[PDB]
């Protein structure tokens, strides 16, 4: 065994394109529409609960997730990828910030941490 | 601490006092020293409370995972898991555990695991600081294949004496009965056992 894939699976093509990122964006394009609007005294994020079956209880599937008491997230694309990112985002808000400064991270810095995780899946082996 | 487990005709009964001391201060006078590691496999704990709780929790985890894969474990198997933890970590543990359980095939069984982490299968076992004072009494009064009522009386009288002489023992006498019929908890208060 051992993970023997220690090389990048995303690489530059002759045209300068990073194929796997483009294809990931194509998967996002197929995803259900979600949106966000910023007001003077608040922000709203919204999406459609596209229920896969009427027998499914769509309340048990949360597309909009609390990351911190003052930060929320919504997505478009692959649900399972989102779910694990929410787990990582929640944890990193504690490990790389709250356990250091005794307060929750500002939005931009939590976004920065999530972004870093997504960047690494674009370069790591 | 005064703890014991006694096999009898219908199975096995575990007994214990309820006193936990920090020096001469009684930090808990209503301690439950009879610990469930499986439905019909229990143990009596003596020594470091931290150690015996940690060990018991790990055993309960092991037997839960055992049960999910291989079905109900034997009392011998439970004793083996206790022994493995006690023997391999003997340098860092202060634990004296009596394991008691009921199978339908094997019926009531008692295993004692003293400080070193050795295992000894016995008809009955006594342990804890208070046990020293009742070696004579227990040896003279134990019989094999006693009734439930006789075994309750034997444990009640034994632990009564252990409590009487050992300052580290006291409070209520707790008992857990393990038979085919199920699991029964008993409790006996000072006003009852002190007049025996």
């Amino acid at each position: 065994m051992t993970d023997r894939y220690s090389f990048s699976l995303t690489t530059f093509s002759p045209s300068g394109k990073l194929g796997q990122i483009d294809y990931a964006l194509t998967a996002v394009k197929q995803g259900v529409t979600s949106l966000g609007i910023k007001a003077t005294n608040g922000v709203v994020i919204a999406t459609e609960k596209k229920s896969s079956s009427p027998l499914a209880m769509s309340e048990t599937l949360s597309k909009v997730s609390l990351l911190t008491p003052d930060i929320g997230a919504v997505y478009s694309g692959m649900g399972p990828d989102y779910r694990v990112l929410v787990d990582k985002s929640r944890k990193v808000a504690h490990t790389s910030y709250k356990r250091i400064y005794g307060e929750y991270p500002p939005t931009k810095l939590l976004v920065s941490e999530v972004a870093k995780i997504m960047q690494e899946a674009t370069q790591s082996g | 601490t005064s703890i014991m487990a006694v096999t009898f005709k219908d199975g096995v009964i575990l007994g214990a006092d309820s006193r936990t001391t920090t020096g001469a201060y009684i930090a808990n006078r209503v301690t439950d020293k009879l610990t469930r590691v499986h439905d019909k496999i229990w143990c009596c704990r003596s020594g470091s409370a931290a150690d015996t709780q940690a060990i018991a929790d790990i055993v309960q985890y092991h037997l839960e995972l055992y049960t999910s894969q291989y079905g109900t474990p034997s009392t011998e198997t439970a004793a083996s898991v206790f022994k493995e933890l006690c023997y391999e970590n003997k340098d860092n543990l202060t634990a004296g555990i009596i394991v008691a359980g009921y199978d339908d095939k094997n019926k009531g069984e008692v295993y004692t695991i003293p400080l070193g982490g050795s295992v000894h299968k016995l008809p009955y076992a006594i342990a804890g600081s208070g046990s020293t004072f009742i070696y004579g009494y227990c040896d003279k009064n134990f019989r094999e294949n006693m009734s439930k009522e006789e075994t309750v009386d034997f444990i009640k009288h034994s632990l009564s004496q252990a409590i009487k002489w050992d300052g580290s023992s006291g409070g209520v006498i707790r008992m857990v009965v393990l038979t085919a019929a199920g699991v029964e908890r008993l409790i006996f208060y000072p006003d009852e056992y002190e007049q025996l």
Partner: protein, 233 residues
């Protein structure tokens, strides 16, 4: 220098409006072994003083003989031995305190904590402590060993300062002492259920109560307590 072998635990006491109360259990421990169950640790001197002793029992028995000898000696060539020239609590204490401090100064202490409780000739309450170091102090409530940590807080709720003494009756004081003895029995691993209690009153004199027991104990709540965290059965 030695070590205590056979030991007695707490002695507790307090002042009330007309006198003093003192109490101590009847156990003689041998380490964690509850060896001797009929040890009297309150020793009356005359009809006006009770000396309560904790710690080493062999030294207690020695002190008991000193006090017995003190009474004999005081009576010698003393026509008023049972009147004006009877032993006072203050005389008995000062003598013991002298002995205790002398013995610690020779590096050979009497391994005890002592409370002298009594009523003086003029009716004044006497309550003073002395131990193996020769340390002495007085307080409206006094207790040794575990009693100091558990009895005093309870007894101080009744008599918190000097001005509370005249407001405290013998019934309230005895009730407080008896409750404290129960608490000590719950929480001191070297205590026993059996104890003695002595009341020295300026009107009714010395009342010495033997073979008292801790009663009205709460244990029923123990039946609901299971495991040490997650266990339900």
């Amino acid at each position: 220098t030695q070590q205590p072998i056979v030991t007695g635990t707490s002695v507790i006491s307090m002042k009330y409006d007309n006198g003093v109360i003192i109490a101590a259990d009847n156990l003689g421990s041998y380490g964690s072994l509850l060896r001797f169950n009929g040890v009297e640790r309150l020793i009356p001197v005359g009809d006006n003083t009770v000396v309560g002793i904790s710690g080493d029992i062999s030294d207690m028995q020695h002190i008991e003989r000193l006090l017995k000898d003190l009474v004999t000696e005081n009576a010698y060539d003393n026509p008023l031995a049972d009147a004006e020239e009877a032993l006072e609590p203050s005389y008995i204490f000062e003598y013991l305190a002298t002995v205790m401090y002398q013995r610690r100064s020779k590096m050979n202490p009497l391994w005890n904590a002592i409370i002298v409780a009594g009523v003086q000739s003029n009716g004044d309450q006497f309550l003073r402590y002395v131990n193996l170091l020769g340390v002495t102090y007085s307080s409206p409530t006094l207790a040794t060993g575990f009693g100091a940590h558990m009895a005093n807080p309870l007894l101080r709720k009744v008599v918190d300062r000097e001005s509370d003494i005249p407001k405290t009756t013998v019934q309230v004081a005895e009730e407080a002492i008896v409750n404290a003895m129960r608490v000590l029995y719950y929480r001191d691993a070297r205590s026993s259920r059996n104890f003695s209690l002595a009341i020295i009153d300026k009107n009714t004199g010395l009342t010495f109560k033997k073979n008292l027991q801790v009663e009205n104990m709460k244990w029923d709540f123990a039946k609901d307590i299971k495991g040490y965290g997650t266990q339900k059965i």
